[PDB]
């Protein structure tokens, strides 16, 4: 279950070391490719002409072993940001030499430190190697949660440690990483190897790393506590951080010497396995969404496009959704037909957008449990789904169900309905065009008629995720605007991210709509208080719907319907990341626009800084009518 590596700075014999490390149960070894003490000269004679091999041969291991079991480490003397010109020049040449050897060997990853504020020249040399040949290898930036200068023992008489809170100051190492990756222009081959110390910083320092591309977590043996039996364990707070890192599926790296001397070495790794086994089992939703974590998808458009058989099959796998619709229809039937009218009053029910028939079946189950009489119409514009419906109608339903192959906006209904039932909702509620569809169907609902759903509301929340920002960035396609990928929403199971403020309501629609000429166009301004230092990358979108009275469905995290997986959140990205300071307000503007052919969203950030208006006139994204 847990992927773990050993970090060594001393490898006297490569084959013997790998064997010992594999026996201990580790999956990989982080090790120096050149002797860490073997300082090399490239410019001055006589040392520049040092003979013999500069390092160990590639012949010592198989190609498979170099490709899968070895993570390279940059030599500790390589200081590209040195104040000394000579060191800076020798370090640039040595860094390029070591990175080129790593690429020669086909190493899956290479470790580089971020151990001071200024790594400008280290970033420049790294960016230059990245734009030179084979683009497969990963660079893991070794950065601590807490800088060595901020965790030093208070033992220097004339230099006391700072006992005052420095909110932004304690977040310093994040700015080391941020500046480095900004310089290297968000290369996807550049990730974080987060190093954990004996004492954890405040939660705000830890949360600063949310949404960051963490590929590895470094655990020094010195951070481990000892139990009554003498075996290495971790503090409750450390365990809480391990659990968070396990959800990100990071590779753990064990560094330092055995400090539990009379208790063997694999014990550190045995403890990580224990924590991994002793974690909460995933729920129905989590087991369903496994594989979709941060996987960007195009939002379905069931109006403009005809959904495929398997899409309808995925919809139907959600037990919660339909049992909620059944409960809403059941209550509505009881409210509309008194017990005394039980055998004479036949309610006309229209399922508008029937798909393969689950809401038709939900309506019939609802009528049986309410002990009421119903007359059903199943309206569906997709002719492929109409095949399934017509086969169901002949084989099972009978005359009680009339299947209609039509767009609900065009259908000349032969009778008026008591109840119209539909499920035309997207992840942002109105994004599949439920308002336009139900507005066109409204004329065949009786004056006292009920629409299920009765109402829906979309919600937005600002988010931070450099991981998702880079994921959207990589969606640049040929023959379109090079920035179009930032002007369109994505359906995504948000995972490695930070929600920056509580979701706030954006747009509301009510059915039936009794505000003449309707006007489904909308304009909303939202002001989000932010209590953290962060970077804004986009807005998470959710929704809630009132099916009937107290019977609802929600994907809003705080009121999420339990076990309901029909909708993942939506993400509205922004083109350029926005720095937000603690105590600032994020002000976002969202518009719902249309013409007679298409509906689209436009959005902009106006505080703390303005962004461009995204998707003007639906230039990058539209929803077909």
């Amino acid at each position: 279950r847990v992927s773990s590596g050993r970090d060594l700075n001393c490898v006297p014999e490569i084959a013997d070391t790998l064997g010992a490390v594999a026996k201990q149960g580790f999956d990989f070894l982080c090790m120096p490719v050149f002797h860490p003490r073997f300082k090399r000269e490239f410019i001055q004679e006589p040392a520049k002409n040092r003979p013999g091999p500069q390092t160990r041969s590639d012949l010592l291991l198989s190609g498979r072993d170099w490709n899968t079991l070895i993570v390279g480490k940059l030599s500790p003397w390589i200081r590209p940001d040195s104040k000394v010109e000579k060191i800076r020049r020798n370090s640039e040449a040595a860094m390029l030499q070591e990175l080129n050897f790593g690429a020669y060997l086909g190493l899956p990853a290479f470790l580089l430190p971020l151990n001071q504020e200024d790594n400008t020249n280290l970033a420049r040399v790294l960016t230059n190697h990245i734009h030179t040949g084979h683009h497969s290898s990963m660079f893991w930036m070794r950065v601590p949660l807490v800088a060595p200068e901020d965790l030093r023992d208070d033992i220097i008489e004339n230099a006391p440690t700072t006992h005052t809170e420095e909110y932004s100051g304690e977040e310093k190492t994040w700015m080391w990483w941020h500046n480095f990756r900004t310089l290297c222009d968000y290369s996807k081959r550049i990730a974080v190897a987060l190093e954990i110390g004996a004492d954890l910083p405040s939660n705000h320092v830890i949360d600063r790393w949310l949404g960051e591309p963490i590929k590895a977590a470094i655990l020094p043996t010195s951070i481990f506590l000892t139990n009554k039996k003498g075996f290495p364990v971790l503090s409750k707070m450390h365990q809480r951080l391990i659990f968070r890192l396990l959800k990100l599926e990071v590779q753990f790296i064990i560094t330092g010497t055995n400090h539990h001397s009379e208790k063997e070495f694999c014990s550190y790794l045995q403890y990580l396995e224990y924590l991994s086994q002793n974690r909460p089992p995933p729920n129905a939703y989590e087991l369903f969404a496994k594989g979709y974590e941060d996987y960007l998808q195009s939002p379905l458009q069931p109006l403009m496009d005809n959904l495929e058989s398997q899409t309808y099959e995925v919809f139907e796998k959600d037990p919660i959704k339909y049992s909620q619709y059944q409960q809403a229809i059941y209550k509505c039937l009881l409210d509309r037909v008194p017990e005394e009218e039980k055998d004479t009053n036949v309610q006309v029910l229209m399922v508008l957008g029937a798909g393969r028939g689950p809401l038709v079946n939900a309506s019939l189950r609802a009528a049986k449990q309410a002990d009421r009489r119903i007359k059903l119409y199943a309206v569906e514009k997709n002719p492929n789904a109409v095949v399934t419906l017509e086969n169901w109608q002949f084989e099972e339903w009978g005359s009680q169900v009339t299947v209609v192959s039509s767009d609900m906006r065009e259908w000349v209904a032969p009778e008026k309905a008591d109840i119209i039932v539909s499920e035309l909702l997207g992840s942002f509620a109105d994004n599949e065009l439920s308002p336009e569809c139900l507005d066109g169907a409204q004329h065949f609902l009786k004056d006292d008629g009920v629409s299920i759903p009765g109402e829906y509301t979309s919600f937005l929340a600002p988010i931070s995720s450099s991981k998702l920002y880079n994921e959207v960035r990589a969606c640049r396609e040929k023959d379109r605007d090079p920035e179009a990928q930032f002007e369109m929403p994505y359906v995504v199971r948000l995972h490695n991210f930070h929600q920056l403020s509580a979701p706030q309501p954006c747009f509301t629609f009510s059915h039936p709509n009794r505000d003449p000429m309707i006007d489904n166009n909308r304009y909303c301004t939202l002001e989000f208080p932010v209590e953290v230092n962060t970077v804004l990358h986009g807005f998470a979108g959710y929704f809630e719907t009132v099916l009937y009275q107290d019977i609802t469905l929600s994907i809003r995290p705080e009121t999420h319907s339990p076990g309901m997986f029909s909708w993942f959140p939506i993400l509205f990205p922004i083109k350029q990341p926005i720095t937000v300071r603690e105590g600032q307000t994020i002000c976002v503007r969202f518009w719902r626009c249309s013409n007679s052919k298409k509906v689209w969203y436009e959005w902009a950030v106006t505080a703390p800084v303005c962004s461009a208006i995204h998707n003007p006139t639906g230039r990058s994204y539209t929803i077909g009518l």
Binding site: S298, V314, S427
Partner: peptide
Amino acid sequence: SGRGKGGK
């Protein structure tokens, strides 16, 4: 899943 299509 979750109202989405495409991706990879």
